[PDB]
Symmetry: C2
Subunit: 405 residues, 2 copies
């Protein structure tokens, strides 16, 4: 940076602290990643200056020739990545992408069927303190109490009983492959639309390491910033038949001017995802998650569903008589960043929890491999088996530092 | 830029075109401005990598120590700028800031009173194709047919007849000072909340050149990117009594993770706005608008309301027998960027219109003064009085180029 340090010492000092934090810590928050310098440069561009309400070639202002090229690059690359008939790259966030789809096909008070929030579903899939649960009548399907895999007979039964207008598949904390074919079969049986929120798994889908929801879903929503390793924002994919309605839902429906600089960054990230090396990266993410899962089990930990098919895992801390809150706090003390997370059928509140959620996307981007996964697991074991030993925690601290340099 | 040119030639080429466009054209779109290099650097920072759901000191994840400092800098500087008891700097946009306030105090189908959209009101103030008009029952107050000033007796009558739960004051195309005291008096009479959407005038308010709505309104919403000259995003200001509800409306209500890098950029912009030189800038914006208004009248143009009190003016093109659409198109041909805009009691559709909206915030940032305003007015006169003369348009083109170098 050149201008920020002189203009705003306070903001610059804090940013520098954050930059150094990102390097020093072992980042295991499943929703996080590290974007490229190219992506950041696009976000830091003059495109922030341009109002571009509407869409490429159909804007409500002149002078959009070049931001049009940028948005179309984003849309076409997204279509190439996911095989979608239509892309909308304007959503400000995952929340807004979901909001727009709901706005498209639902009326106030319509019934929607989504994944149980304490079993892996997201806030925007029907929380009573979120617009989704306030605006629409959400009902939930669960995972099996033993296998922690989605119970598709429960999905079907809930669908047949409640007759939802829309079924939502996908999750913020589900470590296994989701069967989109089964979701569509159930949706077809009850005459419901299917929406897949692939936010967490989007990069894995792009790399062919998780089945693609696009051929099965009427709408696919995603964030651009998780496994897709892009800027912070949202996106909607759908078939041509819903293109006009989806676009109108985003504008003039729920948003105003798009963030053109972020859209540029989206294009950049999509370009990166189209490369062969991204596919290799995504395989390492999944490989690392499996290795970390196995290594954690070797340390004596129980995992929700008994492992992982994707980038993330959930540790069930009940055998260690620890809450997620306790584990999260003590791991923070040694430089390992996780989040407390409800496990299926958790006896604790979502504010305490019996689990921690861990993902490998960020550490993989930093170049961590299988050996590092073993060491991360060993450090977690050392910490969680010795929460009352400051000497153990100091050793963990040093081993964390050894990993990040 | 260093990394983007090598990584993504296509995106870089388009960005460079846009950068050169921004320099070459005379930008008169009233909602636009040019941000500082410091603001852009903040947006291009590693803060995009951080999930920070929740609020400073009350986050739902660890590792937020430094993004907390950043967000608090944004909040405190905003409070210093506007004298507000509480700030929420997380809204992704003006649309989302408004959405959150509506979410806070209104139930589905509640009556809201806002400015007539064809008289100056915004899309998010009740358009039937916007969430606001779909989710809530919007009624409208108008401006006087002769003076084009808000008819406060009409505001009062509509309020007393329809009994709104909420009254919205502020506009996207109103060239005069809004009387917030009168809006509050009317709101008090009917037991309605008052929300002021100061998006367009926020910078002028910060500089003491437009009355501050904060002491009169329960909620004040704004964008950060218009006269405030900040990054693209939204903000909510309110008294302490609504702080908790407003914060909960943004998260977990309507959004998810905030854009921390944009919030950093917000802090930077607020820092800039606190400086003496910003106040001088804002005075030049208003001075330039008055001068441009007077110079346009000297060229024979009629202005909505007969002039301006702020950064923007509306030309009523009816005396020239031109539509806003026609004027917008031909000005584009010579390098002057405006938007077609409905005038009060427009005989034309919002897609054709009888006016053009012009603002001086962007050209003032570029260092344009009174002499440049005279020349801009003269060029507009030359163009709009000779729409069928290619020689006239070429002269205009050359005079535009002379202004921007």
């Amino acid at each position: 940076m050149k201008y920020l340090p002189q203009q705003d010492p306070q903001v610059f000092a804090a940013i520098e602290q954050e930059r150094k934090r990102q390097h020093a810590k072992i980042e295991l928050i499943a929703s996080e990643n590290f974007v490229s310098r190219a992506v950041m440069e696009a976000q830091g561009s003059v495109l922030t200056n341009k109002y571009a309400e509407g869409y490429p070639g159909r804007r409500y202002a002149g002078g959009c020739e070049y931001v049009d090229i940028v948005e179309e690059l984003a849309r076409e690359r997204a279509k190439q990545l996911f095989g979608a008939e239509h892309a909308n790259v304007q959503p400000h966030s995952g929340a807004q992408a979901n909001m727009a789809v709901y706005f498209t096909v639902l009326e106030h008070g319509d019934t929607v069927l989504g994944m149980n929030l304490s079993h892996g579903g997201h806030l925007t899939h029907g929380s009573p303190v979120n617009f989704s649960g306030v605006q629409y009548n959400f009902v939930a399907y669960g995972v099996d109490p033993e296998t922690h895999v989605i119970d598709y007979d429960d999905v079907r039964e809930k669908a047949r009983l409640h007759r939802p207008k829309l079924i939502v598949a996908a999750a913020s904390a589900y470590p296994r492959i989701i069967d989109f074919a089964k979701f569509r079969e159930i949706a077809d049986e009850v005459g419901a639309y299917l929406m897949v929120d692939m936010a967490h798994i989007a990069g894995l889908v792009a790399a062919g390491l998780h089945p693609n929801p696009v051929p099965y879903a009427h709408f696919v929503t995603t964030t651009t910033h998780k496994t897709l390793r892009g800027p912070r924002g949202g996106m909607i994919l759908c078939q041509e038949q819903f293109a006009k309605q989806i676009d109108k839902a985003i504008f003039p429906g729920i948003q105003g001017g798009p963030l053109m600089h972020v859209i540029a960054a989206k294009a950049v990230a999509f370009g990166e995802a189209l490369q062969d090396d991204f596919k290799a990266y995504a395989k390492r993410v999944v490989d690392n998650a499996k290795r970390l899962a196995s290594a954690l089990q070797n340390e004596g930990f129980t995992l929700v569903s008994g492992g992982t098919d994707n980038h993330l895992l959930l540790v069930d801390l009940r055998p260690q008589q620890l809450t997620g809150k306790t584990a999260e706090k003590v791991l923070d003390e040694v430089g390992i960043t996780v989040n407390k997370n409800t496990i299926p059928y958790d006896p604790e509140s979502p504010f305490v929890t019996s689990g921690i959620r861990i993902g490998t996307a960020a550490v993989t981007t930093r170049g961590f491999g299988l050996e590092e996964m073993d060491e991360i697991a060993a450090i977690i074991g050392l910490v969680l088996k010795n929460v009352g030993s400051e000497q153990a925690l100091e050793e963990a601290r040093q081993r964390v530092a050894a990993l990040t340099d």
